[PDB]
């Protein structure tokens, strides 16, 4: 029931010929609605969800101008970070940024986030009060001092408590048929003989939203954790998620095994068995 | 909507 909006920026320098690439993607919970890629022929902010397509040309130009400025500022930030961490024109380097709002009970801000990384590692994060920073080291302390003096925290807080909360609510209303709708997993247990004495039982969970799900096997009410083959939750490519869990069992002993599914879209947690 | 630009300079890292 709790909702969130997230923006993910990826800024990458090129050792070879070309300008650093800036890519921004926006998400409402597990749904990507927007993208911007500077590497494109003519860089433009684009819709990735049908419900954002109702926004006028002023919304898109406002987005495009924010991202084109961030692209230029990131190329300077990349040039800077390799000056802090004394690096070279030699390698390719990545600045990643994740920020956004969590919707609270009274409709206000529950929590605001702003986290930055350099080369896959934590660099600087905005604290819970939204007035202080936490630098993972010294030199990200250089970034910190530059940001404390330029009152960056106050600018972030204004957006997080303000516009971020207001825009998320608009999206939630505009795409309520999907964003506020939890999709239950379409479940089945498939049987796959491996030998004359063994068979694979695979429990499938398909077409679910959101991505969070639990899938476990039990043998006579006993958890099969160590003997369970569990793939990571994966996108179907149609906005839903897929997942399966498998157990190798003695042939004929199938009825002893139960598959347990828990998902938001399920009225009750499911108990599944192979249906021969 | 992404974080919009400030009236001043957008501070780099």
């Amino acid at each position, epitope marked *: 029931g709790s909702h969130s909006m997230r923006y993910f920026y990826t800024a990458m320098s090129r050792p070879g010929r070309g300008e650093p690439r800036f890519i921004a993607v926006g998400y409402v919970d597990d749904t990507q609605f927007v993208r911007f890629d500077s590497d494109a022929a003519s860089p433009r902010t684009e819709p990735r969800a049908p419900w954002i397509e109702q926004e006028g040309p002023e919304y898109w130009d406002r987005n495009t*101008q924010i991202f084109k400025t961030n692209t230029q500022t990131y190329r300077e930030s990349l040039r800077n970070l390799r000056g802090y961490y004394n690096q070279s024109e030699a390698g390719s380097h990545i600045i990643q940024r994740m920020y956004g709002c969590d919707l609270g009970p009274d409709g206000r801000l529950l929590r605001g986030h702003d986290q930055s990384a350099y080369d896959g590692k934590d660099y600087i994060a905005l604290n819970e009060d939204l007035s202080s920073w936490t630098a993972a080291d010294t030199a990200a302390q250089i970034t910190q001092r530059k940001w404390e003096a330029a009152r960056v925290a106050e600018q972030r807080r*204004a957006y997080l*408590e303000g516009l971020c909360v207001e825009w998320l609510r608009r999206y939630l209303e505009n795409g309520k048929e999907t964003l506020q709708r939890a999709d239950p997993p379409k479940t089945h247990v498939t049987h796959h003989p491996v030998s004359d004495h063994e068979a694979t039982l695979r429990c499938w969970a398909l077409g679910f939203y959101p991505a969070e799900i639990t899938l476990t096997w039990q043998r006579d009410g006993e958890d099969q954790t160590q003997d369970t083959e569990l793939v990571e939750t994966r996108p179907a490519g149609d906005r839903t998620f897929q997942k399966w869990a498998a157990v190798v069992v003695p042939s004929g002993e199938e009825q002893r095994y139960t598959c347990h599914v828990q998902h938001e879209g399920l009225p009750k947690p499911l108990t599944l068995r192979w249906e021969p | 909507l992404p974080e*919009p630009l*400030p*009236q*001043g300079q*957008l501070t780099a890292y």
Partner: T-cell receptor
Amino acid sequence: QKVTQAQTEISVVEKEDVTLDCVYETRDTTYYLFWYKQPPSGELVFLIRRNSFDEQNEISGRYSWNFQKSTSSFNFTITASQVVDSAVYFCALSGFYNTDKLIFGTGTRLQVFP
Amino acid sequence: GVTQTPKFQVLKTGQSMTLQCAQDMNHNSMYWYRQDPGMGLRLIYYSASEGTTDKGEVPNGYNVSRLNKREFSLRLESAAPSQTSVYFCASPGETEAFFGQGTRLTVTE
């Protein structure tokens, strides 16, 4: 968006206290306000910037402000009044973004008398 | 801060002039105001960015030009007596509005 300074002209007795009112109207959840001083010279002198989320109410010498986000009022008090306070005082309101407009009130002329 | 010229100007009605305003703080936003008795400061035009210019409260009788990040010029075309005012330009930051000196302009018949 709107900023209102009802008082056109106020007088004050030297060594006494005076309060200048400012009432704003905004649809923004986050914004910031200013108090500017305009002495007879005609220059615009920065006094204070107060962000909407700021709770910490300030005192700076004979100056003290009272931000009440509830009653949408940002009132400026001058204590132990001196002839140097005789100026025009402006209150301003702006949003945090580049697309936003910084807006001023009609001002309030204060005259301090012995 | 903000560098604004000229300080004083006498203009004949129908004449045209351009007020200068420059900031080296690399700010996105630049604003042009006019101050008149009992009206306080009134926004004429503002610029949110280098290629952008948007109307303020009182844009009539004026034109602006945002060339580069530094400059925000205000053009008076066929100056009218109603344009006799004090003009101020501002480029707000995270701290203050950054006002220029002010242009006291008189449009005479």
